[PDB]
């Protein structure tokens, strides 16, 4: 049957970003207090809070060097709504202060939460896939996220995926195949091969980073620095381990609930590897990844 991929919120009727006063966020974080801290950060610290509306938010205090990550976020996630993208609700810009206020996502990031069975994990892979295809295939210019990872997948009340952290994000004209940057930005164990060779990002880069995050869901392990790995990231630990046995790489917890999903779990691993191809052009688009997951389920 025929799917329509993107039928999320019409933007014209959507709540605009609320420009928030500093004093407001200062009071609600109880003084940007350490106990109100959720996120010790690359680009800022993240404070849990409740506004004067009663609405739960997560506030990102961005660190002022002597405002690119602010503007990266305003120009991309601040312009768009989708069920699988975190809702940026408002912002604050005073003097040299740049704050970003998000809807608070009840179960925090996926990494922290890794308390969820297989049906719940595939719901996370698919929903996280869908949100990355939004960025690639349904925005123009395309959005290249440039930092996909477990801690950048948040989880709501119903445990659906919500792609997060757009501080790295970049707009790329639909007419272009790549975009040229200045530095190598990434999170260790997530960085695609060709980014080490060139200062260029692409949507195909995001596809690589995506697959790693699929392994995390398959195997239940961190992407780097776990006891079994030895020398390599889990891209290496999955790639070599295979010939020995494939089904051993899977998270015990999934396998333990049922011997019947042994096969449903293998095919999802075929998708993840395809994303992890060393030649960008051979990788599925986030839209092909979605069809891959849907074929599997019939």
């Amino acid at each position: 049957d025929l799917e329509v991929l993107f039928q999320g919120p019409h933007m014209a009727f959507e709540k605009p970003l609320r420009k928030l006063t500093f004093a407001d966020l200062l009071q609600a974080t109880n003084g940007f207090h350490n106990d109100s801290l959720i996120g010790s950060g690359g680009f800022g610290d993240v404070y849990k809070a409740i506004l004067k509306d009663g609405s739960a938010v997560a506030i990102k205090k961005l660190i002022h060097v002597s405002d690119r990550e602010f503007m990266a976020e305003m120009e991309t996630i601040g312009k768009i709504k989708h069920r699988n993208l975190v809702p940026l609700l408002g912002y604050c810009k005073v003097g040299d202060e740049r704050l970003l206020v998000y809807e608070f996502m009840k179960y925090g990031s996926l990494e922290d939460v890794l308390k969820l069975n297989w049906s719940t994990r595939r719901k996370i892979a698919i929903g996280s896939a869908r949100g990355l295809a939004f960025l690639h295939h349904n925005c123009s210019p395309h959005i290249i996220h440039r930092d996909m990872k477990s801690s950048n997948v948040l989880l709501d009340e119903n445990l659906e995926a919500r792609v997060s952290d757009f501080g790295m994000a970049r707009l790329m004209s639909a007419m272009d195949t790549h975009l040229s940057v200045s530095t190598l930005a990434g999170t260790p164990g997530y960085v695609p091969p060709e980014y080490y060779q060139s200062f260029r990002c692409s949507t195909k880069g995001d596809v690589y980073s995506y697959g790693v995050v699929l392994l995390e869901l398959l195997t239940g392990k961190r992407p780097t620095d776990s006891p079994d790995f030895g020398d390599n990231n889990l891209v290496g630990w999955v790639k070599q381990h295979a010939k020995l046995r494939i089904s051993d790489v899977f998270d015990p917890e999934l396998m333990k609930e049922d011997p019947a999903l042994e096969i449903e779990l293998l095919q999802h691993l075929k998708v993840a590897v395809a994303c992890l191809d060393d030649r960008a052009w051979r990788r599925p688009t986030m839209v092909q990844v979605m069809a891959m997951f849907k074929e599997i389920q019939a």
Binding site: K239, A242, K243, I246, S247, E262, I263, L266, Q267, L269, K270, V273, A274, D277, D278
Partner: peptide, 15 residues
Amino acid sequence: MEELQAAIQAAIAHC
């Protein structure tokens, strides 16, 4: 690469 993906399909077929 080709090997790895082929290896995975071998496995799936078997099961």
